[PDB]
Amino acid sequence: MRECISIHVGQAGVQIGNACWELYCLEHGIQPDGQMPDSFNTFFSETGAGKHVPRAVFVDLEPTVVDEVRTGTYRQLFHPEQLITGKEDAANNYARGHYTIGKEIVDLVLDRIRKLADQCTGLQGFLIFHSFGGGTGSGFTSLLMERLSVDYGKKSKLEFAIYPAPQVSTAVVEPYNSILTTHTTLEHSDCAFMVDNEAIYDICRRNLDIERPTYTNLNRLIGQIVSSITASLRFDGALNVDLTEFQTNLVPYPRIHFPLVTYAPVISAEKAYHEQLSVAEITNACFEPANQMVKCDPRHGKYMACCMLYRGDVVPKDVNAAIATIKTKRTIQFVDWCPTGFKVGINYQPPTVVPGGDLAKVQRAVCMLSNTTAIAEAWARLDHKFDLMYAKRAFVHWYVGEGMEEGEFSEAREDLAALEKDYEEVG
Amino acid sequence: REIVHIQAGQCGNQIGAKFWEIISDEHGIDATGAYHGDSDLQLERINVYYNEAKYVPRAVLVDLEPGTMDSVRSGPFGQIFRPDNFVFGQSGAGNNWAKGHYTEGAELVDSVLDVVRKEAESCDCLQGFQLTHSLGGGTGSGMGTLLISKIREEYPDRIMNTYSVVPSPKVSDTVVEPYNATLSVHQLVENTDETYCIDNEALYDICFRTLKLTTPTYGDLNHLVSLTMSGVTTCLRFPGQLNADLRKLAVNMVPFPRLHFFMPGFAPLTLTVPELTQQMFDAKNMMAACDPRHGRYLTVAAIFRGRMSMKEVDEQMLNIQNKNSSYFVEWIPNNVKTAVCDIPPRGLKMSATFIGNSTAIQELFKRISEQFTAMFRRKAFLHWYTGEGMDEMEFTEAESNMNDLVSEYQQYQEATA
Ligand SMILES: Nc1nc2c(ncn2[C@@H]2O[C@H](COP(=O)(O)OP(=O)(O)OP(=O)(O)O)[C@@H](O)[C@H]2O)c(=O)[nH]1
Ligand SMILES: Nc1nc2c(ncn2[C@@H]2O[C@H](COP(=O)(O)OP(=O)(O)OP(=O)(O)O)[C@@H](O)[C@H]2O)c(=O)[nH]1
Ligand SMILES: [Mg+2]
């Protein structure tokens, strides 16, 4: 029919996946054991016993977080052969994850996806969750991308990558792995939803008033945005029906496949007495730079495409009024040769949050996917850090001692340098 | 995952025994090996340094001089160690590197390597080894280097952490040691991935200038060394995200291989957070004798222990990085890493630990360099080694490599973006 596979790599990917699948089950009413008391069948496969199991592959080169999954309250929801561990990790090194450690485990991983796919008939592709600062989350993600493209060349693929941020950063070599994984992955992906940890951290500090947001809050919010993105795939919507329609509507050119994602509104649970924010107010909040998942200035860049995804008790006429109000502005600058409209898909299922988190349920909400040239600067900062290290050949021996050639770094840098040019080319 | 502890020589055995006693007190394991603490956090990562069968340390104890058996067996933790793991020779080395490296180390090295093999094959996954030894003597230094070389050629893919103490005249005032120190630093540069360069001069200075003591014996010095060892391994022993294991620690802290010598620091010395943050960077709190403001740090790991607010420590670490931004190299973005753990060390409520790869360490080697220049150019005690299967060429090449290391540290100190 229409089926999707979820792939989770590394610690960040696995924890985001925990949050996302927990929220999916809470939204669809699936009990933690998997027994449901179907348009959503795209993300869950049912068995003879009525047991709905996710099509999720939890991958890690070290077993700590996967074991955390196996001892959690969702232990019986996932199948034991769908969760893959290892005895040695990459130690924050893209070279170890991609070249050394990844060889011993990629075959088993691909076999597991093969068994998952033989239960599928209408696969559109994979939704890969991973990060940029990790050795596993970059190296094995890249190798899996390459092997899947070799194996599923017709099929589509998406990322939900995590942009490194200093406050929660763990390694000093994060720009190295980010540049390496981007250079190798740019060819085998259709649409990447980068998320900046500094943006989420700031939202939790400001909107949610959390003094020290730990990883739990970050993954909960990221699950909210990811679920809001995939609702069209899971709730039988009128737009973005399959994974190909994403890249058709948001990625008009091969290289530039990096949309900017915005979620509104964000209200702390302790502010439960909040009055319901109107459609106009949240529509305005969409374009406020203080509520974006990647830190950049869309005001200072030129758009390429844009789409709205509403949720809740939302009436189309008020949506059209808000769109008309926003359109007659000088702050929105599309290019001079492309459809200067908003592909507005409207959903009516109410927004629902995790019972227990610091977010409060809001009767209506909205997400905004805008492919623009602003996010370009979000790349440049990374390159800056890269330019500060490879010039002195700092830390390069750790990579070269695990099966990587030194000049590759330069190539990778050059690639994103070229990427940057494309951003000014369209702008 | 597991770490196979190794200690050699009198100093190595003493500091290792102190390390084991302190971490056993922290982890709630009694002197008989059983657990009697009252936290879940203590057992989350207890397999790293212990074996369950009661908990048994994963240690091998080596000393050519055979008396130190009973001393080790007379400590508060003398019966927990595996009796086979004691690998002691018959005769002492007499503070000669060549004696412990060519004529008498070469006999007991086989048995100690076999014991190491037996300990390593019992682990599902191994991070690496930690050698607590001494660079001034002839048993710790020469034997330590020989075992490091043998293990590195036998386990090419294991991280070889070590702890080394550089001797000072203010502690012993013996004259032959700098030859052993130079010959050992040669192997440490060549065949090691990270090193916590402890200085006896620094410990004497802290004990005298600060603690207001006559600073006798090895009790207080080993107490301070034990505290620092507990602080530095706090991240590996307890659950956390910064430097979860030895390889992640080395990747985080060591750029430019052969430049992996670290300046430890601990506080308080035996109370609000801001004074902890100010003191832990201060020159009065370095176990390697130098001024950290005389050099530029390349990498820094700061570990806080106790109950404290995270926002305050983050603010103060940001403030320190901002104020002293002259001393932090600008070509390593975000080179200061920060970890906070809940369990304080035994007897202390609020504690701070610092590990810094800094260029200031260069002046330490220069110091040792001059001491070597004070004797090698005078042909002092040369035949003591030439009669033991040693050649002057090794002395010359060790001097050259140490001088090249000094030059490297100076070059990376002077470099700019
Ligand atoms: N959203 C989110 N990001 C995280 C989380 N944990 C870590 N990160 C980010 O991920 C980065 C590290 O990447 P990881 O994927 O965790 O690295 P890894 O999977 O352990 O790969 P190896 O280190 O080689 O084992 C860190 O710098 C964090 O910024 C999390 O729980 N949620
Ligand atoms: N701080 C401190 N230093 C020590 C201790 N034990 C030995 N040392 C130092 O070690 C030096 C003596 O040489 P060692 O390295 O101990 O040699 P050894 O371990 O006794 O073995 P041999 O070389 O055979 O004598 C002295 O200068 C001391 O400063 C100790 O317990 N604490
Ligand atoms: Mg990991």
Radius of gyration of chain A (CA) equals 21 Å
Helix content of chain A: 40-55%
Number of helices of chain A: 13
- Could you tell me the number of beta strands of chain A? 14
CATH architecture of the largest domain in chain B: 3-Layer(aba) Sandwich
From the alpha-carbon coordinates, what is the Rg of chain B to the nearest angstrom?
Answer: 21 Å
Kindly list the characteristics that best describe this protein:
heterodimer; A: 427 residues; alpha/beta; Rossmann fold; 6-stranded parallel β-sheet; 13 helices; 14 strands; 15% strand; globular; B: 417 residues; 60s Ribosomal Protein L30, Chain: A; Helix Hairpins; two-stranded antiparallel sheet; 14 helices; 12 strands; binds guanosine-5'-triphosphate; binds magnesium ion
Q: What does this protein look like?
A:
The complex is a heterodimer of chains A (427) and B (417). Chain A has helices at residues 10-28, 64-70, 94-118, 135-151, 174-185, 197-206, 215-234, 243-250, 279-286, 316-327, 375-389, 396-400, 407-426; strands spanning 3-9, 44-46, 52-54, 56-59, 83-84, 123-129, 156-160, 162-163, 191-192, 195-196, 260-264, 303-312, 343-346, 364-372. Chain A is α/β, with parallel strands linked by helices and 427 residues long. In chain A, helix 2 links the parallel strand 4 and strand 5. In chain A, helix 9 crosses helix 10. Chain B has 417 residues and is α/β, with parallel strands linked by helices. Chain B has a ten-stranded mixed beta sheet, with helices on both faces. In chain B, strand 2 (50-52) and strand 3 form a beta hairpin. In chain B, helix 12 packs antiparallel against helix 14. The longest helix of chain B is centred in the C-terminal third of the chain and has 23 residues, at 392-414. Residues 10-11, 62, 89, 136 of chain A line the site of magnesium ion (MG). Chain A: The active site is at 245.
